[PDB]
Amino acid sequence: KNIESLFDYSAGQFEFIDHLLTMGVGVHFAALIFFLVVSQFVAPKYRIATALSCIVMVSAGLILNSQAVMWTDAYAYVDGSYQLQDLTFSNGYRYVNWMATIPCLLLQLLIVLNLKGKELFSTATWLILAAWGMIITGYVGQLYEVDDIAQLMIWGAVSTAFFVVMNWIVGTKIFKNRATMLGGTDSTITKVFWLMMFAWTLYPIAYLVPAFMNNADGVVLRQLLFTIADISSKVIYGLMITYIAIQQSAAAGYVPAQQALGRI
Ligand SMILES: *C/C=C(C)/C=C/C=C(C)/C=C/C1=C(C)CCCC1(C)C
Numbered sequence: 478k479n480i481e482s483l484f485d486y487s488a489g490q491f492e493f494i495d496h497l498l499t500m501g502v503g504v505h506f507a508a509l510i511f512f513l514v515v516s517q518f519v520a521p522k523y524r525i526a527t528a529l530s531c532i533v534m535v536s537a538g539l540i541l542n543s544q545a546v547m548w549t550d551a552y553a554y555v556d557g558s559y560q561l562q563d564l565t566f567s568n569g570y571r572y573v574n575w576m577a578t579i580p581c582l583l584l585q586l587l588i589v590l591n592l593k594g595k596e597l598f599s600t601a602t603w604l605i606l607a608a609w610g611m612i613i614t615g616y617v618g619q620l621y622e623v624d625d626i627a628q629l630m631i632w633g634a635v636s637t638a639f640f641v642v643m644n645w646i647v648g649t650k651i652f653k654n655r656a657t658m659l660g661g662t663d664s665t666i667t668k669v670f671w672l673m674m675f676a677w678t679l680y681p682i683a684y685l686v687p688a689f690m691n692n693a694d695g696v697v698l699r700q701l702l703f704t705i706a707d708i709s710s711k712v713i714y715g716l717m718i719t720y721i722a723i724q725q726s727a728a729a730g731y732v733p734a735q736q737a738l739g740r741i
Pocket residue numbers: 575578579582611612614615616618633636637640677678680681684707710711
């Protein structure tokens with residue numbers, strides 16, 4: 478049902494996708510160790526924001542690892558090209574993983590925005606419901622990326638509606654609570670919003686690849702887009718969230734945070 482299954486791949490195409498996925502694994506688990514060691518410099522009220530980055534790193538790292546092994550399982554070099562064997566490859570499992578990772582990315586944002594109690598629970602709930610609507614409708618849509626391009630587009634339209642509403646909630650919370658943030662992170666959190674807008678929008682572009690580039694090179698392009706997007710939306714994002722957590726911790730008088738920023 479996926480366009481990946483339609484084509485044979487040259488040695489170059491096959492190996493590049495393998496390297497993209499493998500590199501993705503290394504980047505996330507490398508970042509995992511960074512987030513782990515810096516967590517001790519975060520104040521208790523923000524420390525879960527940094528923990529969520531660890532959780533996202535392993536989750537994304539495992540799905541990338543799984544995709545890489547699925548890639549090598551499904552294809553073998555036969556008569557001059559990599560051809561599909563018995564096992565299959567699908568991006569569908571990425572969608573399932575987003576059901577967990579996207580709420581995590583949203584939650585660590587709400588935390589450094591200094592949301593608490595009732596407002597935190599209610600905002601998270603609406604955000605997660607919007608994200609799940611986006612992901613599920615998108616998942617259904619990509620089931621038709623070979624059989625029914627029209628259906629892919631309509632489901633994508635519905636998914637985009639959830640996407641836009643989700644982004645509106647995020648933007649509204651960011652620009653409203655910006656004033657509550659310490660140590661100059663009121664400026665930093667604004668760049669985080671724009672980072673999210675840019676990075677998350679790469680995913681629907683990858684989703685539409687079967688519509689404007691239905692060939693083996695399009696398959697390479699989609700994996701390349703995912704790689705750029707994953708690194709930007711999880712790793713660079715996580716690094717900025719953690720920076721914001723540490724900076725606000727120091728400004729609130731957390732001594733290990735103050736000492737940490739003092740060494741650098
Ligand atoms: C770490 C993974 C992330 C941040 C994934 C984000 C995914 C999206 C923003 C996906 C959005 C989609 C649309 C807006 C339309 C097409 C269907 C989706 C699900 C690909």
